Design a protein around this ligand. Structure first.
Ligand SMILES: OC[C@H]1O[C@H](O[C@H]2[C@H](O)[C@@H](O)[C@@H](O[C@H]3[C@H](O)[C@@H](O)[C@@H](O)O[C@@H]3CO)O[C@@H]2CO)[C@H](O)[C@@H](O)[C@@H]1O
Ligand SMILES: OC[C@H]1O[C@H](O[C@H]2[C@H](O)[C@@H](O)[C@@H](O[C@H]3[C@H](O)[C@@H](O)[C@@H](O)O[C@@H]3CO)O[C@@H]2CO)[C@H](O)[C@@H](O)[C@@H]1O
Ligand SMILES: OC[C@H]1O[C@H](O[C@H]2[C@H](O)[C@@H](O)[C@@H](O[C@H]3[C@H](O)[C@@H](O)[C@@H](O)O[C@@H]3CO)O[C@@H]2CO)[C@H](O)[C@@H](O)[C@@H]1O
Ligand SMILES: [Ca+2]
Ligand SMILES: [Cl-]
Ligand SMILES: [Cl-]
Ligand SMILES: [Cl-]
Ligand SMILES: [Cl-]
Ligand SMILES: [Cl-]
Ligand SMILES: [Cl-]
Ligand SMILES: [Cl-]
Length: 650
């Protein structure tokens, strides 16, 4: 890891990079950080206020020796500039700076293209990376965040199974392939996903993550990583391209992916990890401006609230600028439709609200959701963008972990049951999530002001899959009983207020063989198992029908807490069940009233229904023995674990 030299403070008037007054100097406000290429000339601008000298080092090959090094000129607000009056297309470059007595060399933090494994910046005209028709790329319409159905997917998982029927296995382009077929001729890949009716694909890290995670020069050897180890924030990951050595390939191919998804009616959410970098000692930030971009404790060690070694100092002005401009680059250059913020509670509220404001100026339908977990850091508590501060973060969704644990049981105590598996006392937790996590009334309240702030889920890339958690908590159960519990959990997600979130393969009861944290497990653990999918086409059709049910009923998709408090009523129901009505054409629903029963009781039950008119079955008729509407008391005869939905027609 070597020596870190924080600078000769006389360069900065005696003001140390750790000093509070440093944030008031060198606040560069320009739009031109990085390299601006043209055949005529390339202009470079680097922010490096503590350096006493700065150089652009040019390379002809990603692996070669320097062919030239050119001094930069100290410019305004701690920046350095250089323009090369030659056509620099096809060259690579780094910056070399002298900070204190140290000479450090680093990739441009604003790199838009890189060589293999991201060790040099690549110079190219990004307009040459646009797919044909990119100008006319248009997004599918989205009227509300509550209208999204998110499908969380890893690019390698999608296609790497040997029977996926996809040619470019493990690559961005594998998700562009239409008409792919798996075992028994079932649809796979893109056709499987569009056939589900989901609206957004949320991609696990597609920015460039570190060579230590996946070596982009050894792709002919087994490899796998989720990618939560950021190296170059503004360029795609090389291993997802057909040629990691061609700087343009990963860019063009990611754009081809996004274009195809948009044409097939899907939006794309990027999982972004601005809370930490792969290695706080080796990252370009620390080589170029040591001590500025990462968070330090009072004793000048890294704050490590992420448990990854370091935290990005989002609250300092140039890093806030970096993050915002990075997000805007993904929106503008790649047409991205949303962001999921890893460990969002490590990011400060001012930065998050500024991101949301800048995105709203461009397209307010762009989604922003994040992990709003309460986690210690040197960042003061009142500035953490987490659930405790959700009232200060309007428009930003957060994963509802209270709902998640109430439905399927505690994710950290593997054997513990929850609502679906017959545990006691989880009804109110489910009800809190049904209401979108808002302050609904009495003890039914969570962190959300508005339901657009609550993301509902029972599975994601983290922790056991829903199937694997059910198996660990239901030792006495048959696989048939477990499948019924699994289906019930998915139904709760898709009929709760807020934003529904599905893990890729949840539709076929995805298993990881009991592996809890699969971030670097082999492909045999992590792939989308299209054989299992082919054996679970009934369960896939069930998920498709649930998604269609939510689409048909805007009562499930209410945009405001005021609507939920006016139209949602919880009904009397026995233990191990939850029952509620969505009354009076909620949200523009075509039917007059809906009644929803979550039944976790495997036996027979006779339930009193609200006398709201001639109820008829809309979903889950397989559980309904009889339905009596009374004068039009009203009563429902049910058996077995699952969801039942009734409606009073207009
Ligand atoms: O190499 C540094 C770091 O690697 C390992 O941490 C990994 C986690 O084990 C893994 O689960 C994943 O964690 C991320 C979550 O998936 C994500 O949704 C969110 O909760 O943030 C987490 C971090 O971004 O990825 C990390 C990083 O690769 C290892 O366990 C650590 O001990 C180690 O310090
Ligand atoms: O080494 C760090 C850690 O990273 C990963 O842990 C993540 C959890 O897997 C993930 O569920 C989430 O944990 C949060 C709970 O979901 C939430 O209900 C509440 O309790 O806050 C938790 C975070 O404090 O995020 C963590 C942290 O990234 C990885 O899976 C672990 O193996 C690993 O230890
Ligand atoms: O579409 C409304 C309908 O959705 C749900 O029914 C699904 C079943 O739960 C699911 O198992 C599957 O069942 C069908 C099989 O795919 C098929 O091979 C054959 O056996 O017919 C079955 C239908 O009886 O697909 C259906 C439809 O997706 C939900 O359970 C119903 O309550 C609801 O009416
Ligand atoms: Ca990489
Ligand atoms: Cl670097
Ligand atoms: Cl199809
Ligand atoms: Cl690969
Ligand atoms: Cl580190
Ligand atoms: Cl906190
Ligand atoms: Cl809560
Ligand atoms: Cl219906």
């Amino acid at each position: 890891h070597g020596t870190i030299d924080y600078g000769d403070v006389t360069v900065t008037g005696g003001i140390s990079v750790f000093d509070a007054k440093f944030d008031e100097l060198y606040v560069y406000d320009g739009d031109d950080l990085g390299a601006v290429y043209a055949p005529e000339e390339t202009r470079f601008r680097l922010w490096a206020p503590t350096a006493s000298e700065a150089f652009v080092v040019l390379y002809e090959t990603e692996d070669g020796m320097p062919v030239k090094e050119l001094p930069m000129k100290r410019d305004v607000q701690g920046t350095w500039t250089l323009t090369v009056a030659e056509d620099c297309g096809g060259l690579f470059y780094t910056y070399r700076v002298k900070v204190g007595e140290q000479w450090n060399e680093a990739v441009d933090p604003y790199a838009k293209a890189v060589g293999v494994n991201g060790t040099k910046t690549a110079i190219l005209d990004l307009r040459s990376t646009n797919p044909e028709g990119w100008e006319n790329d248009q997004k599918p319409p989205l009227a509300s965040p509550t209208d999204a159905v998110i499908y969380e997917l890893h690019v390698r998982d999608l296609s790497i199974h040997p029977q996926s029927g996809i040619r470019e296995k493990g690559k961005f382009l594998g998700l562009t392939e239409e008409g792919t077929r798996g075992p028994n001729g079932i649809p796979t890949g893109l056709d499987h996903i569009t056939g589900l009716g989901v609206t957004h694909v949320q991609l696990l890290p597609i920015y460039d993550y570190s060579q230590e995670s996946v070596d982009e020069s050894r792709l002919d050897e087994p490899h796998y990583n989720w990618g939560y180890d950021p190296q170059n924030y503004n360029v795609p990951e090389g291993s997802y391209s057909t040629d990691p050595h061609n700087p343009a390939a990963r860019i063009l191919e990611l754009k081809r992916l996004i274009q195809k998804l948009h044409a097939r009616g899907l939006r794309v959410i990027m999982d972004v990890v601005y809370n930490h970098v792969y290695d706080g000692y080796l990252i370009h930030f620390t080589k170029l401006v040591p001590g500025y971009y990462l968070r330090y404790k009072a004793d000048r060690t890294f704050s490590d609230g992420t448990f990854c070694g370091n935290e990005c100092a989002s609250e300092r002005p140039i890093m806030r600028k970096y993050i915002i401009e990075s997000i805007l680059h993904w929106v503008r250059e790649y047409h991205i439709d949303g962001f999921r913020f890893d460990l969002m509670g490590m990011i400060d509220i001012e930065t998050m609200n500024e991101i949301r404001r800048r995105l709203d100026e461009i397209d307010p339908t762009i989604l922003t959701i994040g992990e709003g977990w309460m986690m210690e850091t040197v960042l003061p508590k009142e500035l953490r963008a987490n659930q405790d501060n959700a009232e200060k973060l309007p428009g930003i969704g957060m994963f509802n972990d209270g709902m998640r644990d109430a439905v399927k049981g505690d994710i950290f105590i593997f054997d513990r049951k929850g609502f679906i598996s017959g545990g006691d006392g989880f009804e109110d937790g489910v009800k809190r999530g049904v209401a979108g996590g808002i302050n609904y009334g009495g003890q039914l309240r969570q962190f959300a002001v508005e339901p657009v702030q609550s993301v509902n889920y029972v599975e994601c890339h983290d922790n056991h899959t829903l199937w694997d958690k059910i198996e660990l908590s239901t030792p006495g159960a048959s696989d048939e009983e477990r499948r019924a519990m699994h289906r019930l959990a998915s139904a709760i997600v898709l009929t709760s207020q807020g934003i529904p979130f599905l893990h890729a393969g949840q539709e076929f009861m995805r298993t990881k063989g009991g592996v809890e944290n699969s971030y670097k497990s082999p492909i045999e653990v992590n792939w989308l198992d299209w054989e299992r999918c082919a054996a679970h086409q009934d369960d896939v059709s069930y998920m498709r029908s649930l998604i269609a049910l939510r689409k048909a009923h805007p009562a499930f998709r209410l945009k405001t807490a005021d609507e939920i408090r006016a139209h949602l009523r919880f009904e009397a129901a026995p233990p191990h069940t939850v029952a509620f009505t969505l009354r009076d054409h909620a949200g523009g629903d075509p039917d007059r009233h809906l009644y929803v029963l979550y039944n976790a009781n495997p036996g027979a039950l006779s339930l009193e229904l609200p006398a709201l008119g001639p109820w008829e079955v809309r979903f889950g008729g397989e559980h309904v023995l009889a339905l009596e509407a009374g004068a039009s008391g009203a009563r429902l005869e049910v058996r077995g674990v699952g969801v039942v939905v009734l409606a009073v027609p207009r």
